[PDB]
Paper text:
Our SELEX approach based on a N40-degenerate sequence revealed that the KH domains recognize two different types of RNA motifs: CA-rich motifs and elements with a common GGC core. To determine the individual contributions of KH1 and 2 (Lys192 to Ile355), their RNA binding was inactivated by mutation (GKEG motif to GDDG), while maintaining the crucial tandem context, resulting in four possible combinations. Our NMR data clearly proved the integrity of all constructs. SAXS (small-angle X-ray scattering) data back-calculated based on the crystal structure are in good agreement, indicating that the crystal structure reflects the monomeric solution geometry, which also closely resembles other tandem KH domains. Indeed, KH1 clearly favors binding of the GGC motif, while KH2 prefers binding to the CA-RNA. Given that larger NMR CSPs were observed for the KH1/GGC, compared with the KH2/CA-RNA interaction, RNA binding appears to be mediated primarily through KH1. Indeed, ITC revealed a measurable KH1–GGC interaction in the low-to-medium micromolar range, while the KH2–CA complex could not be determined in our ITC setup. As expected, a 10-fold higher affinity compared with the single interactions of 7-mer RNAs indicates a cooperative binding event that shifts affinity by one order of magnitude. Our data suggest that in complex with KH1–2—similar to the situation with KH3–4— the RNA adopts a looped conformation that fits the narrow window for linker length between motifs.
Research on IMP3 largely focused on its association with many cancer-related tumor entities, since its re-expression correlates with a poor prognosis for patients, classifying IMP3 as a tumor marker. Importantly, we used a very long degenerate sequence (N40) as a basis for SELEX, to allow multiple RNA contacts with more than a single RNA-binding domain, and a corresponding bioinformatic spacing analysis. This led us to the discovery that IMP3 recognizes—through the activity of all of its tandem RNA-binding domains—an extended array of multiple cis-acting RNA elements, composed of CA-rich motifs and sequences with a common GGC core. Members of the IMP protein family are prime examples for multidomain RBPs, where both affinity and specificity are achieved through simultaneous engagement of multiple domains with their respective RNA elements. Taken together, our in-depth analysis of sequence requirements for IMP3–RNA interaction and the functional validation supports the suggested safe-housing mechanism: Through sequence-specific formation of RNP complexes, IMP3 shields a specific region within the HMGA2 3′-UTR that contains miRNA-binding sites in close proximity, thereby protecting the mRNA from let-7-mediated repression.
Numbering used by the authors: 192 to 236, 239 to 355
Write the structure that this text describes.
């Protein structure tokens, strides 16, 4: 107690500049306000960079929601009309509670949030990337609530491992 698995996101490279901000001001502000460690890494491919967030369950969600706001706000200013999905990366070993019983908890979460949630096919991953991509289509507030309940279920697998 409490759980130590990070939230990993895949965000479009479009919106990374705004998430970091000028002089790294935006990202630092989010780490202060959420007490998180946020690190932005290139990803071998997709035109996306990964964002790793180590914090408490709640600060993680607070940080995720801020990133969703900034992404959506940035999407307005470059006239990006499409809905920007939230893509959570989750290690395959810890997705059993989401995909288990014909994806019951996945569809449960869909219904509770008004989101369309899709998980990348097992076959798509490599030995260099064991993380499944969980794509949540919705909107800022609905994607963030969806992140809370997805990461709850991912942490349930992790904390009931063996």
């Amino acid at each position: 107690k409490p759980c130590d698995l990070p939230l990993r996101l895949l965000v479009p490279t479009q919106f990374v500049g705004a998430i970091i901000g000028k002089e790294g001001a935006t990202i630092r502000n989010i780490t202060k306000q959420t007490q998180s460690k946020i690190d932005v890494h290139r990803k071998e491919n997709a035109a996306e960079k990964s964002i790793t967030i180590l914090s408490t369950p709640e600060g993680t969600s607070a940080a995720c929601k801020s990133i969703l706001e900034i992404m959506h706000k940035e999407a307005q200013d470059i006239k990006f009309t499409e809905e920007i999905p939230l893509k959570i990366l989750a290690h395959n070993n810890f997705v059993g509670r989401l995909i288990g019983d014909d994806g019951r908890n996945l569809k449960k979460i869909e219904q509770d949030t008004d989101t369309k949630i899709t998980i990348s096919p097992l076959q798509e991953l490599t030995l260099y990337n064991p993380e499944r991509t969980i794509t949540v289509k919705g909107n800022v507030e609905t994607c963030a609530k969806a992140e809370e309940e997805i990461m709850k279920k991912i942490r349930e697998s992790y904390e009931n491992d063996i």
